[PDB]
Amino acid sequence: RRAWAELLAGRVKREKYNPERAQKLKESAVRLLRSHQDLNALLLEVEGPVIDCDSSEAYANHSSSFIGSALQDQASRLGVPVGILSAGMVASSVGQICTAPPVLLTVEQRKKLSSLLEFAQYLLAHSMFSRLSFCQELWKIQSSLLLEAVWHLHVQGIVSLQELLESHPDMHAVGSWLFRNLCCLCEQMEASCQHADVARAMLSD
Amino acid sequence: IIKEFPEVYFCERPGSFYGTLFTWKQRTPFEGILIIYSRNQTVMFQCLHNLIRILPINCFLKNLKSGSENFLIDNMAFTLEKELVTLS
Amino acid sequence: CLDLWREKNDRLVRQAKVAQNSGLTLRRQQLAQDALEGLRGLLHSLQGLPAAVPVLPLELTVTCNFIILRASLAQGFTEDQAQDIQRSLERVLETQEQGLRELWDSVLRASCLLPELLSALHRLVGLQAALWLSADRLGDLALLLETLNGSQSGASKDLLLLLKTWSPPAEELDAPLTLQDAQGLKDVLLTAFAYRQGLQELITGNPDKALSSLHEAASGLCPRPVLVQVYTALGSCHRKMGNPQRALLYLVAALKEGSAWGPPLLEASRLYQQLGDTTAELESLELLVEALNVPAPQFLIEVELLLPPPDLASPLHCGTQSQTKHILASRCLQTGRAGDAAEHYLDLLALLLDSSEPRFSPPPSPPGPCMPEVFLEAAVALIQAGRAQDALTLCEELLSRTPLWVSATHLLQGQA
Amino acid sequence: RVQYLRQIHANHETLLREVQTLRDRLCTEDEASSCATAQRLLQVYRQLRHPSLILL
């Protein structure tokens, strides 16, 4: 009898939902099925055995309209939207730059990154760029990344600090990630007055 | 179909539509954009009648003067993305 | 007089359509079965004259209009309709005995004499075909279409070829009205038969024959609920071939064009075990519980008439809230997130026993474990949580209520 | 004044960041293109056209 009263689950009633909740449901569902998506695997699936190299066909030219029409052709093979390819291919070419050798990356990294980001704005102007497929494909990298790269993102208006960090699953991982980068920065910005200027700029930012 | 431009078709039906030209682009195989180049505006009507009769039931025709609904919306949003950035 | 009958049909046809387009759930049905009985009586009136070459066209026309309306309101066929077809056919022959198959053979030779009624006949064949394809009589259906076309198409024992090779005969010139034509049916059949061939080949373990028919399904008529199915299904086809990424896309598509998004979230759970992505698996099923919380017809042969009810083995089969919530707690407990599995199990057990007031939660299937196995699973989850006094209460209740399970009861009571 | 342009600045930065995400939902077919987009943007428009460009 006491057994009954203790077993009796209060939350046994689930009413028919509001049709708004059904779309929220279908959105969190498509979010989930894509968070576990990869494109490299897709290219090995549909195409037989990805960088700017792959889509542009091994350094063909660096003309903006040309590389855009290359992402259209890639997306046509796959049947993924062009925004999704472009997000991934930039996040991949981001991994490239930030790996090849501490929080700042200050020489020539800046040059390739600026040429890259001036292409990213071309992408953003033709709207060929899912921002949030990009946020998610950065936190798939998460480790190669440096605070200098992310601050250029912010200031060149590709993402904002707030739009990236509010599309990270583990709020602790973001906290610890920044905590490390800020500690190494405040260690830095006495190494030289040149590096300290850029460091003080992004620290105030 | 014209081979050289196979996004175009020419009517060969031997009565009142003859030589009318259409084009069809599908996008989201629900939604699609027909363009009709006709020889007068009668023949433009006779067409949509013959075709609203063979469509499915909820088939919401509706007339574009001024750019596809999708495109306009980007063209709008754009000119804010820039405006608001400029206002920032 | 032919005038009047033609007139009455046409009238009733428009009545039928108006009820369809317009109306209330009640008033629809009122005018529907109104027109039904009208068609009956016009049926009976003509069924009362001997043969009549000029009347035949309407006769056959009429009965079609009936069967269609009859079956559509019923939302399912029956064999009374086969008898109606048998009758009308026998009449056709009486103009110029044994079983449907010889009748049709003799019928299509009497029509190859070209009496001008073929517009109805191919229509009847579509109907005959809708029945037999509801009845899985595909050998005879093929056979009819072979005599229909050249019998040269006699080696060609695929259906999907014959259905296409079959040409509905006329633009169907100014006749007595109908509700539906050979084309508008031929087009339901291709999509239906193809859909069925597809699920067959998938479950029977040929996810390469499948993809041909499951893309013949999206192409030619495919109402969107028919599509969400085609897409969950290709999500399995590719999961089975080992193409998780190709699958995933077809599943996301099924989500959006989804009004019906239990079966995709199920196909995702089965995919995230197969990769082992356990947090994702459990989440796809949690969402599934909530997708099976939230929940109109036509006087015309839809594609949903000639769809089967689902087997247990199919990727399209989804159980009910209770069954699925057990799968979630089961799939949670096998993982060892037992505190959370236990929470799922006490919401399961409440929905099975406390459920007195609402609709009765569906009972477990015979192949699946019975009630007691489930009480014990609940108690185990409780132990793993560290809710031991509460496990004692569960076990005491079970013993108060009523083999292997008793011995085990004592055991878990000890572990508590 | 300064208080002024910052009240304007925050009232802007929300509208932009809203639209931005709206664009992406138009890219990925996540939202819908049809409308509510149409009528939301024409509301964004209406918000700003009111005291547009006080010229001093």
Q: Which residue does chain D place closest to B86, by CA atoms? A: D12
- The number of beta carbons lying within 10 Å of the beta carbon of residue C367 is 6
Interface test with D, best of B73, B78, B85, B88 (most D CBs within 10 A): B73
Q: Which of residues 125-184 of A touch D (CB under 8 A)?
A: 127-133, 160, 162-163
How many CA atoms are closer than 13 Å to the CA of D56, on its beta-carbon side?
3
Against chain D, the chains showing at least 3 CB pairs within 8 Å are A, B
Encoded tokens for B55? 């469509």
The residue assigned the tokens 């103009």 is C95
Partners of residue B25 on adjacent β-strands: B33
Whether the CB of B83 is below 8 Å from some CB of chain D: the reply is yes
For the packed helices C100-112 and C118-134, what is the interaxial angle rounded to 10 degrees? 160
Residue B10 forms beta bridges with which residues?
B21
Distance from C-alpha of A134 to C-alpha of A114, rounded to nearest angstrom: 17
* Longest CA pairwise span in chain D (Å): 43
Compare all CA atoms of chain D with the CA of B72 and give the residue at the minimum distance.
D38
What is the DSSP-derived secondary structure letter of residue B56?
A: -
Task: Return d(Cα A91, Cα A70) in angstroms, integer.
Answer: 17
A100 touches chain B (CB under 8 A): no
- Which of C294, C324, C349, C352 is the best residue to mutate to test the A interface, defined by the most A CB atoms within 10 Å of its own CB? C294
Nearest Cα to Cα of residue C269 among C348, C328, C310, C312: C328
Distance from CA of A47 to the nearest CA of C (A): 12
Dig out the tokens for C176 from the structure: 């007595």
Chain B CB within 8 Å of residue D25 CB: no
Smallest Cα distance from B12 to chain D, Å? 35
Tokens 């819908």: give the residue.
Answer: D32
| Chains A & B: contacts with CB separation below 8 Å | 6
Q: Is B77 helix (H, G, I), strand (E, B) or coil?
A: helix
Check CB contact under 8 Å for A157 and B85: yes
Q: Which residues contact B55 (CB under 8 A, 6 or more apart)?
A: none
Q: Which two tokens stand for residue A201?
A: 């700029």
Q: Which of C224, C191, C177, C214 has its CA nearest to residue C306?
A: C191
What is the Cα–Cα distance from A57 to A88, expressed in whole angstroms? Answer: 17
SS (H, E, C) chain A: CHHHHHHCCCCCCCCCCCHHHHHHHHHHHHHHHHHCCCCHHHHHHCCCCCCHHHHHCCCCCCCHHHHHHHHHHHHHHHCCCHHHHHHHHHHHHHHHHHHCCCCCCCCCHHHHHHHHHHHHHHHHHCCCCCHHHHHHHHHCCCCCCCHHHHHHHHHHCCCCHHHHHCCCCCHHHHHHHHHHHHHHHHHCCCCCHHHHHHHHHHHHC
Chain D residues with beta carbon closer than 8 angstroms to that of A82: 27
Tokens 């990925």 correspond to: D28
Name which of C302, C303, C319 is nearest C311 in CA terms. Answer: C319
> Which residues does a chain break follow in chain D (C to N more than 2.5 Å)?
none
| Contact (CB, 8 A) for D9 and B88 | yes
Buried (b) or exposed (e) across C234-246, using 16+ Cβ within 10 A?
A: bbbbbbbeebbbb
Cβ atoms < 10 Å from Cβ of C371: 14
CA distances (Å), origin C214, targets A44, C198, C260, C269: 23, 6, 18, 22
Which three-class secondary structure string do you get for C141-189?
Answer: HHHHHHHHCCCCCCCCCCHHHHHHHCCCCCCCCCCCCCCCCHHHHHHHH
| Residues of chain A contacting B77 with CB distance shorter than 8 Å | 127
What size, in residues, is chain C?
416
Q: CA C157 to CA C154: how far, in whole Å?
A: 7
CA distance C293 to chain A (A): 6
How far apart, in whole angstroms, are the C-alpha atoms of residue C59 and residue B16? Answer: 36
User: Under 8 Å CB-to-CB from C266, ≥6 apart: which residues?
Assistant: C232, C284, C285, C288, C315, C318
Backbone φ and ψ of B23, nearest 5°: -145, 155
List chain A residues with CB under 8 Å of B83. none
Q: Does B71 touch chain A (CB under 8 A)?
A: no
Tokens 């800046």 map to which residue?
A110
Whether residues D24 and A131 touch (CB distance < 8 A) is answered with yes
Task: Answer yes or no: do A26 and C265 touch at CB < 8 A.
Answer: no
Helix (H) or strand (E) holding D13: helix D3-27
Return the H-helix or E-strand segment holding D46: helix D37-48
Contact of C185 with C170, CB cutoff 8 Å: no
Q: How would you label A24-37 residue by residue, b for 16+ Cβ within 10 Å and e otherwise? A: ebbeebbebbbebb
Q: Nearest C-alpha of chain A: how many angstroms from C290? A: 8
Task: Dig out the tokens for C284 from the structure.
Answer: 């796809």
Here the tokens at position C379 are: 């108690």
- Chains contacting A (3 or more CB pairs within 8 Å): B, C, D
Closest CA to C181 of C226, C103, C125: C125
Note whether C353 contacts A22, CB cutoff 8 Å. no
Closest CA to D25 of C84, B70, A103: B70
Nearest CA in chain A to D17: A163
Burial of B6: CB neighbours in 10 Å, binned 0-12, 13-18, 19+: exposed
How many Å apart are CA D15 and CA D35, to the nearest integer?
Answer: 18
Which of D27, D33, D47, D49 should we substitute to test contact with B (largest number of B Cβ atoms within 10 Å)? D33
> Residue C196: which of C244, C113, C134 has the closest Cα?
C134
Residue C322 has which token pair? 């209770």
H or E element at residue B21 = strand B21-26
Instruction: Report helix angle A82-99 to A64-78, nearest 10.
Output: 120
Buried b (16+ CB within 10 A) or exposed e, C330-366: bbbbeeebbebbbbbbbbbbbbbbbeeeeeebeebee
Chain A contact present for C250, CB below 8 A:
no
Between vectors from CA C227 to CA C255 and to CA C123, what angle results, nearest 5°?
160
CB A45 within 8 A of CB C245: yes
Distances (CA, A) of C52 to C63, C376, C389: 16, 74, 85
**Cβ atoms within 10 Å of A172's Cβ, excluding its own:** 9
Chain B contact present for D1, CB below 8 A: no
Residue C349: both structure tokens together:
């057990």
- Which residues is B23 bridged to in the sheet? B8, B35
Asked if C321 contacts A11 with a C-beta cutoff of 8 angstroms, the reply is: no
Phi-psi region of D7 (alpha: psi -120 to 50; beta: other; left: phi over 0): alpha
d(CA C260, CA C90): 44
Q: Are strands B21-26 and B8-10 parallel, antiparallel or unpaired?
A: antiparallel
Q: In this complex, do D23 and B85 lie within 8 Å of one another by their Cβ atoms?
A: no
Please give the Cα distance from A188 to A177 (Å, whole number).
17
Solving technique? cryo-EM
With an 8 Å Cβ cutoff, is A30 touching chain D?
yes
Question: Is the alpha carbon torsion for A85, A91, A94, A100 positive or negative?
Answer: negative
Torsions phi, psi for B76 (to 5 deg): -70, -60
Distance from CA of D1 to the nearest CA of B (A): 16
What single-letter amino acid sits at C76?
G
**DSSP helix/strand/coil, D27:** helix
- CB-based contacts of C322: which residues, under 8 Å, 6+ apart? C348, C351, C352, C361, C362
Residues of C in contact with A8 (CB under 8 A): 350, 354
Q: Which amino acid is at C212?
A: S
Which amino acid appears at position D27 of this protein?
C
B85 touches chain A (CB under 8 A): yes
Q: Record the tokens describing residue C36, joined without a space.
A: 């039904």
Q: In this complex, which of A27, A84, A127 lies closest to D26 when CB atoms are compared?
A: A127
Which strands form B32-37's sheet, in the order they lie side by side?
B8-10, B21-26, B32-37
Q: How far apart are CA A170 and CA A167, in angstroms?
A: 9
Phi, psi angle pair for C173, to nearest 5°:
-70, 175
Find where tokens 């990154």 sit: A113
Helix (H) or strand (E) run with residue B33 in it: strand B32-37
Q: Which residues of D touch A (CB under 8 A)?
A: 17, 20-21, 23-24, 26-30
Rounded alpha-carbon distances, angstroms, from residue A129 to A91, A121, A143, B22, C371: 12, 9, 23, 33, 53
| Residues paired with B9 in a beta bridge | B22
Tell me whether residues D16 and B88 touch, CB distance under 8 A: yes
Give the C-alpha separation, C48 to C52, whole Å.
Answer: 11
Q: Can you read off the two tokens belonging to residue D7?
A: 């009240």
Given CA atoms C143, C148, C154, C156 in this order, what sign does their dihedral have? Answer: negative
* Residue B35 CA: distances (Å) to CA of B23, B39, C344: 5, 13, 56
Cβ–Cβ pairs < 8 A, chains B and D: 43
Element (H, E) at B9: strand B8-10
Contact B78 A127 (CB under 8 A): yes
Cα gap C215→C252, rounded to integer Å: 17
Contact B78 A125 (CB under 8 A): yes
Question: B8: which residues sit within 8 A by CB, 6+ positions away?
Answer: B1, B2, B21, B22, B23
* Max Cα–Cα distance, chain C, nearest Å: 89
Confirm if C271 and C328 have CB atoms less than 8 A apart.
no
Secondary structure in 3-state letters for chain C: CHHHHHHHHHHHHHHHHHHHHCCCHHHHHHHHHHHHHHHHHHHHHHHCCCCCCCCHHHHHHHHHHHHHHHHHHHCCCCCHHHHHHHHHHHHHHHHCCCCHHHHHHHHHHHHHCCCCCHHHHHHHHHHHHHHHHHCCCHHHHHHHHHHHCCCCCCCCCCHHHHHHHCCCCCCCCCCCCCCCCHHHHHHHHHHHHHHHHHHHHHHCCCCCCHHHHHHHHHCCCCCCHHHHHHHHHHHHHHHHHCCHHHHHHHHHHHHHCCCCCCHHHHHHHHHHHHCCCHHHHHHHHHHHHHHCCCCCCCCCCCCCCCCCCCCCCCCCCCCCHHHHHHHHHHHHHCCCCHHHHHHHHHHHHHHHHCCCCCCCCCCCCCCCCCHHHHHHHHHHHHHHHCCHHHHHHHHHHHHHHCCHHHHHHHHHHHHC
At residue A33, what is the residue type? L
Please judge whether A26 and C255 are an interchain contact, meaning their C-beta atoms are less than 8 angstroms apart: yes
Q: Are C350 and C335 a contacting pair, CB within 8 Å?
A: no
Residue whose C-alpha is closest to residue C342's, from C285, C284, C387, C291: C387
To the nearest whole angstrom, how far is the Cα of A55 from the nearest Cα of chain D?
Answer: 20
**What DSSP state is assigned to residue D56?**
-
SS3 B55: coil
The residue of chain C with its CA nearest to that of A80 is C249
| C389 C-beta neighbours (distance < 10 Å), count | 9
Q: Which pair of structure tokens corresponds to residue C104?
A: 């049709």
Is there a contact between A127 and D28 if contact means CB atoms under 8 Å apart? no
CA angle C262, C263, C265 (to 5 degrees): 65
What is the CA angle C26-C31-C34, rounded to 5?
Answer: 120
Contact C400 A30 (CB under 8 A): no
Residue C136, both tokens:
């899985």
Q: DSSP state, D37?
A: H
Q: Do D38 and B69 touch (CB under 8 A)?
A: yes
Is the C-alpha dihedral spanning A186, A190, A191, A194 positive or negative?
positive
Q: How many Å separate Cα C332 from the centre of its chain? A: 32
Instruction: Note which residues in 304-343 of chain C have CB less than 8 A from chain A.
Output: 321
The CA distance from B20 to B43, in Å, is: 8
d(CA C284, CA C262): 10
3-state secondary structure of D55: coil
